[PDB]
Amino acid sequence: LLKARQERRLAEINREFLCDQKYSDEENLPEKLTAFKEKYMEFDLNNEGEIDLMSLKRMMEKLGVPKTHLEMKKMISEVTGGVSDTISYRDFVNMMLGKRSAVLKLVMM
Residue numbers in the known binding site for Ca(2+) are 44, 46, 48, 50
Decide: 47 and 9 in contact? Cβ < 8 Å: no
Determine the residue with CB nearest Zn ion.
Answer: 27
- Determine which residue in the list 21, 24, 25, 27 makes contact with Zn ion, applying CB under 5 A: 27
Smallest separation, CB 34 to Zn ion (Å)? 9
Note the maximum CA span of the chain. 38
Nearer to Zn ion by C-beta: 33 or 51?
33
- The answer to whether residue 48 forms part of the interface with Zn ion (CB under 5 A) is no
Binding residues: 44, 46, 48, 50
Smallest separation, CB 12 to Zn ion (Å)? 19
Q: DSSP for the chain, please give it.
A: -HHHHHHHHHHHHHHHHTT-GGGTT-TTHHHHHHHHHHHHHTS---TTS-B-HHHHHHHHHHHT----HHHHHHHHHHHHTTS-SSB-HHHHHHHHH-SS--HHHHHH-
Nearer to Zn ion by C-beta: 29 or 103?
29
Nearer to Zn ion by C-beta: 30 or 82?
30
The footprint of Zn ion (CB under 5 A) covers 27, 30
